[PDB]
């Protein structure tokens, strides 16, 4: 019987419940910031404590020291899944909730801080193994190896077949990360809610609202305070620029987004970015589900800290 729970400090506990929330720069604070979570998401009783934590810090120990897709972002994409939901308490059976923490904490894995396009112009091994979301179904293969680590199985009260449904969520979840494959997501999500046909009844309607959950918590860094969006602008750029770096070393000139040497047009490439793929991302999910509203907003507080960028006001 287990009387124990996660408490955070005051300031923590209640900004922790917002959508815009900071996970500081503490790291060693980030398991229990994350089992808070589970706890407050699911219950005490989903997963034993010994092999939740062991899953935790063995994920930490799989994701790299890059500047951007790292354990920071890990933690930082699962408390936007925490946050949605939290504010969407009725809509999600308990095996999702369980499934869909866990899919945000693992869905970079191992990345490298380089794209699909560089591994398939390098002519990576994983490109071979996986022509599609090369990097996506390598984060859900690494997400299996560390789930069948002894100790580390965290369903393991699951029945068969219950078992076998999470891991169905946790990989659709985690290919549902491949940018690549939002833009058609999003505009049948669009259709289906327009013409009134959408029913989170039907399997695989459910599969594409939770594909767009997973773009919207991948992209929240563009729904922080704009301190917070701006200083992790400078770590998205740093991975962009290496990679056009080796870009450069095959030969090959990267697009700007990836050239140092065009550094002048980020403010320019951020709204482009902006009105491309976040504003109609969070537009899209605050139809579906409308108490997600202060995504859109925060995203739309950012695009214009951008035009002013621009307009040399800053
Ligand atoms: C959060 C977040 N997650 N992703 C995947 C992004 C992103 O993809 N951001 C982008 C898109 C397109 N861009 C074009 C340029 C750019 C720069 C200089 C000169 C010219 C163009 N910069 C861009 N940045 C952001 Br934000
Ligand atoms: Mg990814
Ligand atoms: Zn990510």
Redesign the pocket.
């Known amino acids: 019987q287990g009387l124990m729970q996660f408490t955070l400090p005051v300031r923590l506990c209640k900004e922790i419940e917002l959508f815009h929330f900071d996970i500081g720069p503490f790291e060693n604070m980030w398991p229990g910031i994350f089992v808070y979570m589970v706890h407050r998401s699911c219950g005490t009783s989903c997963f034993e404590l010994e092999k939740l934590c062991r899953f935790i810090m063995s994920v930490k120990k799989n994701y790299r020291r890059v500047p951007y897709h790292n354990w920071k972002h890990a933690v930082t994409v699962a408390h936007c899944m925490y946050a949605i939901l939290q504010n969407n308490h009725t809509l999600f059976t308990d095996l999702e909730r369980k499934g869909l923490l866990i899919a945000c904490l693992c869905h970079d894995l191992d990345h490298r801080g380089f794209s699909n396009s560089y591994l398939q112009k390098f002519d990576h091994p994983l490109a071979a193994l996986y022509s599609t979301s090369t990097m996506e179904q390598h984060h859900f293969s690494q997400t299996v190896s560390i789930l069948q680590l002894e100790g580390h199985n965290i369903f393991s009260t699951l029945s068969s077949s219950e078992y076998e449904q999470v891991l169905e969520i946790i990989r659709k979840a985690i290919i549902a990360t491949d ?1 690549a494959l939002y833009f058609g997501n999003r505009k049948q999500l669009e259709e289906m809610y327009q013409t009134g046909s959408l029913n989170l009844n039907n399997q695989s309607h459910r599969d594409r609202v939770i594909g767009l959950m997973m773009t919207a918590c991948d ?1 929240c ?2 729904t922080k305070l704009w301190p917070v969006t701006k200083l ?2 400078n770590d ?2 740093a991975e ?1 620029w290496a990679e056009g770096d080796e870009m450069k070393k095959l030969g090959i000139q990267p697009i ?2 990836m ?1 140092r040497d ?5 403010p ?3 709204l ?2 902006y009105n491309a ?2 504003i109609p991302c969070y537009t899209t999910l605050t139809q579906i589900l409308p108490p997600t509203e202060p995504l859109l907003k925060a995203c739309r507080d950012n695009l214009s800290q951008w035009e002013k960028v621009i307009r040399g006001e800053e």
């Open positions: 940018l992209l860094s563009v992790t602008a998205i750029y962009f700007p987004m050239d065009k550094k002048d047009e980020v320019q490439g951020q482009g970015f793929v976040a």
